[PDB]
Amino acid sequence: WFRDNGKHALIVYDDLSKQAVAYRQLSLLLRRPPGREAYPGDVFYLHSRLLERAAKLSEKEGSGSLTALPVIETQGGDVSAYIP
Amino acid sequence: AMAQGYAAEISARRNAMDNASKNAGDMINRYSILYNRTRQAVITNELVDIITGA
Amino acid sequence: STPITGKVTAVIGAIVDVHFEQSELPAILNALEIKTPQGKLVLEVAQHLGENTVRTIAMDGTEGLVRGEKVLDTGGPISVPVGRETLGRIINVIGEPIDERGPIKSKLRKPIHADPPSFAEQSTSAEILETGIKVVDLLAPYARGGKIGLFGGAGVGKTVFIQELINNIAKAHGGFSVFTGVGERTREGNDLYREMKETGVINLEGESKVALVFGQMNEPPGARARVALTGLTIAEYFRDEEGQDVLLFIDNIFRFTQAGSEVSALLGRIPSAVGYQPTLATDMGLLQERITTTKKGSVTSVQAVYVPADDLTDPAPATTFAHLDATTVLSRGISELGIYPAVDPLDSKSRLLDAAVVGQEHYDVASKVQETLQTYKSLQDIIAILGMDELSEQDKLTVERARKIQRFLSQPFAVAEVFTGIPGKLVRLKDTVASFKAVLEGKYDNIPEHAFYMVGGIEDVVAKAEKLAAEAN
Amino acid sequence: FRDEEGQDVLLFIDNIFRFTQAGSEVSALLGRIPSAVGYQPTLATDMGLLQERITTTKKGSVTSVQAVYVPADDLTDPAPATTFAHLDATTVLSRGISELGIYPAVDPLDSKSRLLDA
C-alpha cells in the first residue's frame, strides 16, 4: 500500500523458517508429497512470491519503495541447508 | 650447544602439538556438525521413502 | 436432558471409531465415555470422518471391546477436578484419584483444552523470580513465567533440586507447585511420593504444597500427551483465581513430543522430519503458550529435557529451545564432587541476565564471577601439571578467588535437612549478589576456602570462619 | 532465428533448474507417484526434450550458455546429475573457492570439457 502510494516502507519477516515449517505442516496435512527434508516442493515458490513484492518503483508509478528484511534461523551455523 | 638445541627443539615440539590440538578441535566441531546433518538427512530419506510406499 | 449416545464401530489399536446419530456428533477434543467392567474408558474425539462417525483416541487400555457398545458424550473436553483439594492427592489424566484416599472434593471442574491468555492480558514486563538457590538466582536466574529447561541426568540430585525449588517457592511468595510426571516410570513415582511424605511437602494430615499428576509409561499413547495439559490446567486455575506464582514441573518434555508424534502416526498423518508429527511446532506452542505470566499472577515451568543421541540439532530439542528463556545444566558429577547443588555455572545460561532486568550491579558481579571461573578452568591444566608456582601473583590471586567462589556457590538445602545435618537457608537474591560482590572485591581472602562450603549468606561464611578459629586455637 | 534467418544464435538462460523445479511443482498435483527426493518421474525425459531441441542443427549453429542451481550445494541431486550428461563444457563454481576469496570460485579440478585434447 505504502509502496504504491509513493511512500517507502520497511518490512521485517521475522523467522520465515517457522513460516516454512507451518507450510510444511499444512502440506503434509493435505497429503502432499514430501521433498528434501520433507519440505514440499513449493517452499521455494512461497518465499519467492513473498519476497519479490518488495522493490523500488520507477518515477512513472510514483517512485515508491518497499524494503524486506527476512530473518532465517540457520540451525548449526550452516548456510548450505535447503531452506537457507 | 647440544643442550640448548635439545631445549629449543622440545619447546617447538610443544608449540606444534598445541597448534595441532586446536586444529583437531576445529576439525572435530565441523565433522560433528556434518555427521549430525548426514544422519538427519538419511533418516528423513527412509521416512519419505516408506511414506511413498503407501 | 437427553444424553448423547452412539455405537462403537471399530477399535484399531488405541484408535476407536464410533458411529453417532444425526445432529448428535460432538466437537473434537471432547471427552467420550463407555461403561467397562474395569472402569471408565474415555475417548478424545480427533476427527470427524463423515457419515456421523468420529475418530477418537483412547486414554486407557482398549481390550475386550465389542462393536455396538454404548457410548456417552460428556459435552466438552476431558475435565479434571481442580481446586485446593488437589494438593496432596495423586490424580491422573482422566481426573480420577489413583491415590485411593477417597474421592476428590473439588468444587470446580475445568476442561483441559483452553486458550492461552490474549495479547492484551500478557504481562509487558520481564520479571525476576527468586529461586532460593544462590548460584541459580545469581548466574542463571529464573524467569517469572519462564520455561526453564533442566539439562540434568542420573545421580545428580535432579529430584532434590525439585523439592528444594518447591519449598523455596512455597516459602517465598505463594508457591503451590504442580508436578507433572509425563511418562512416569511408576517406580521413581512411588519413590517420589514417599520422598514427598518424608520431606513434609506432602502432608497427609496437614496441608500440602504440590499436586502430583502423572500418567505412567504403561498408559496408552495420548494420555501421556494429555497429562501435561491436565497439570497446566491445574496450574492456570491456581494462577487465574488465586494470583500466586505457581510452578510446574514436567518429567520429560521429550516424552511429550514423542507421545505427540506417536498419536499422529496412529491417526494416519505423515511423519514430517524424523518420525516426527507434522504438528510438532503447533503442539509445542499450544502447550508452552498457556504457561505464561499474566496481570493476575504468573506460572513458571521447569521442564526436564532429554536430547536424543546427544544431538542439539534434533527437531524436538530445537522446538523446545524455542521456549526456554533460561536453562540449568546440572553437572554430571563435575560439581557433584563437592558442591551439593552441582549446577555447572559455566554451562547453565539465562536470557534475562541483562542490566535492564536484574540491574547493572547484578550483571557486573555475574560477569566477573563467570569470567573468573573461566580463567581458573583454563589455568587448571597447568595447575594440575606443576601446581601453584607457575602462576603469576595475579594468576594465583584469581585462581584462589575462583576456588573460593566455587566453594561459595554451595548452599544448604531445606529439603536435605534429613539427609546429612545441614540447616538450609533461603538466601535472598539481594543477599546473594551482596555476598558474591563482597567476595569479589577481595577483602575475604584470609578466610579459608572451606568456610564457604555448605554455607549460605556471607555472614554465615564469617561465622564459620570464627568457629574454625575457635576449634583451631 | 537459426532456421529462417540462417544465423549463428547465442541462446542464454539464467537457470534451467527452475524448469525441473516447476515440473516437480506441477507433478504432485498432476497425480503421479513421487520420484527420488520428491522429483517428477518425467525428469530425464522432459529435460532431454527441452535440451535436445537446442543443438547445432546443420543449417546453422547455436551456442547456449546454460546455468544450473545445485540444491543445498549437492552435486548428486537428481536434476544437476541428469543435466551433467547433456553438457560438454561445464563449470561448477564450488563454494569453498568462494570463501577462499578466489573469484571466480570455479573449481579447477571439476571444470572439465571435451575440447581439451591435444
Next chain:
Amino acid sequence: FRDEEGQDVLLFIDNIFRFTQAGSEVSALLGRIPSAVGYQPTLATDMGLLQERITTTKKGSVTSVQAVYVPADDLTDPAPATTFAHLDATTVLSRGISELGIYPAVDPLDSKSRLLDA
C-alpha cells in the same frame, strides 16, 4: 536323504540372501506395505522357516555351509543381521584384508564360532 536314508548329508547353499531378495522382489506387487529400507515385512518368518528346516535331527545329520551376500558390505543390513541368529559358526569375510592381499580374507576378529571353548 537325511530322514528316509538316515544319512549324513552336506547341504551346500550359495547366496541365501537371494531368496529374501526374491521375496522382497514380489512383496510390493503382492500388495504389502514395504518394511524398513525396502524389504518384505515377512522376511524374518519365512527365512526362519527355511533355516529351521535346516537342522540336525535324531534320524540323521546335515552339515550346512551357505554363503551370505551382504549388500554394500554392510553387516547391519536387516537380511544378514537376521541370518546371524540362525548360524552356529559364522565366518565373515572382510574386504579390507582382501585388498591387503590375504585372499582367504576371513576376518580374524569378527568371525566367531560357538564351538570355540576349552
